[PDB]
């Protein structure tokens, strides 16, 4: 039952220890054409594909409350990187998938969430981080968290040079407990894919 | 693969490129397969080529692999998944079902392509394929067996016999 296969563009991702997909704050995009862009917007289907990233090394020394973030979008080299630098205004939702493979004899729990409009959390607010679109990663049950969120912001189109709405966040809810037959460290990798990449207002070249 | 083993072992390193081979029915990694055994007697080919990866680890070890098809045009093949992730790739985990099938597509200018590397010219006319290892958990020695077979629309065209007697 727990065999999932996510396909974006011409790339795929299969997982045999999945727990489900978590839709955060909506199931789809709002109206993409608006009165501000004056209908001079287009869609770039070539950008909607995965790109990998490295979050952190989940060791045994990190206690409750270790918070590791990734402000999206990040420094991208593919077609998305050129889109950020070539068109003035962009908008896109995210489809994020985080994997932390140990083996079934470890223990511990990761809270993987997506936070809009990141702001540094005080040691007390971290107890309510579960208000956001989130899942859990527990080597007892699963090894893959899969969240998907639309584009939400005060402006219909944004300038990702100045304002980065979403932030992927991973917190260690229960520290890793290892045995003689469990992994001694875990490496948490991320796999993110933009969806509905709309662009508007092309810029002059630097060549 | 190296030393004539059909499996690649999980490596403990910061470099996570398990293997890399040219998409050419004369490649060194395909020198023993039945598919190349046929294709050596034909002039041109066309179609998709399937690769089957089978995990052979113990129940207490996990891993997550990725295979990407790097087309021709790049000078140096990528050496890390963060960079090769932009090609046509596929990722898979290890669980109950231990097999994974990836269809190396046929993407090239001419509708048919040769089955022999022409001359001392390098950088194969068809691109490489790189099998990476994203991460692994408590799999120190456990292997991954790789096999190759024909696709749903593979086709060989012109009969020859180049083997010297």
């Amino acid at each position: 039952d727990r065999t999932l296969t996510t396909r974006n563009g011409h790339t795929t991702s299969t997982t045999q220890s999945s727990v489900g997909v978590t839709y955060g704050y909506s199931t789809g995009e709002d109206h993409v054409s608006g009165p501000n862009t004056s209908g001079l917007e287009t869609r770039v289907t070539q950008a909607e594909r995965f790109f990998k990233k490295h979050l952190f090394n989940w060791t045994t020394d990190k206690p409750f409350g270790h918070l590791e973030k990734l402000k999206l979008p990040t420094d991208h080299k593919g077609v998305y990187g050129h889109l950020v630098d070539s068109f003035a205004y962009m908008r896109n939702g995210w489809d994020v998938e985080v994997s932390a493979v140990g083996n079934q004899f470890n223990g511990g729990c990761l809270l993987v969430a997506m936070v809009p409009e990141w702001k540094k959390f005080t040691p007390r607010e971290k107890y309510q981080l579960t208000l956001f679109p989130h899942q859990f990663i527990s080597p007892r049950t699963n090894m893959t968290a899969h969240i998907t969120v639309p584009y939400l912001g005060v402006n219909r189109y944004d300038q990702y040079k100045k304002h980065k709405p979403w932030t992927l966040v991973v917190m260690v809810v229960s520290p890793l407990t290892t045995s003689s037959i469990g992994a001694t460290e875990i490496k948490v990798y991320a796999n993110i894919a933009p969806t509905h990449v709309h662009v508007a207002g092309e810029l002059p070249s630097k060549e | 693969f190296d030393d004539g083993k059909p499996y690649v072992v999980t490596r403990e390193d910061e470099q996570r490129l398990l293997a890399k081979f040219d998409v050419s029915l004369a490649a060194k990694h395909m020198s023993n397969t039945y598919l190349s055994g046929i294709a050596q007697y034909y002039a041109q080919y066309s179609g998709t080529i399937n690769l089957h990866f089978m995990f052979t680890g113990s129940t207490d070890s996990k891993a997550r692999y990725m295979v990407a098809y790097v087309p021709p045009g790049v000078e140096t093949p990528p050496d890390t998944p963060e960079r090769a992730a932009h090609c046509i790739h596929a990722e898979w985990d290890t669980g109950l079902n231990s097999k994974f099938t990836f269809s190396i597509p046929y993407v090239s200018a001419a509708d048919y392509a040769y089955t022999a590397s022409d001359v001392a010219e390098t950088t194969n006319v068809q691109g490489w394929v790189c099998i990476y290892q994203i991460t692994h958990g408590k799999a120190q020695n456990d292997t991954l067996v790789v096999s190759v077979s024909a696709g749903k629309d593979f086709e060989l065209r012109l009969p020859i016999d180049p083997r010297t007697q």
Partner: nanobody
Amino acid sequence: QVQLQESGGGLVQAGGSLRLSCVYSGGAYSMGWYRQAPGKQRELVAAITDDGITNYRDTVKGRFTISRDNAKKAVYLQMNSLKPEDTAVYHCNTVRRVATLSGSSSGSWGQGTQVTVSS
């Protein structure tokens, strides 16, 4: 990829002993000790896994002892019953497949340890 430093080498007579230490910064990959004999190729000596199994070269087997400390992020090589042959520069960095002992020509090395056994 990793920034790692070595220390502990020096000069000693035949039959002495030494303790080489190395400190690294990235992850928990299986480390090992390499030596470049004067005028010979760089060769692996002893390798250790991630919190566990160790493996030694044929010549240095039984006289050396490698150990790891995960908390301090350090690896140690205790050298006993030294011989004039063991003089070299003892580098340390990651190693793949400590069973077969296949070293990694991956990247940059740090030259920090020089051992000179006398006789």
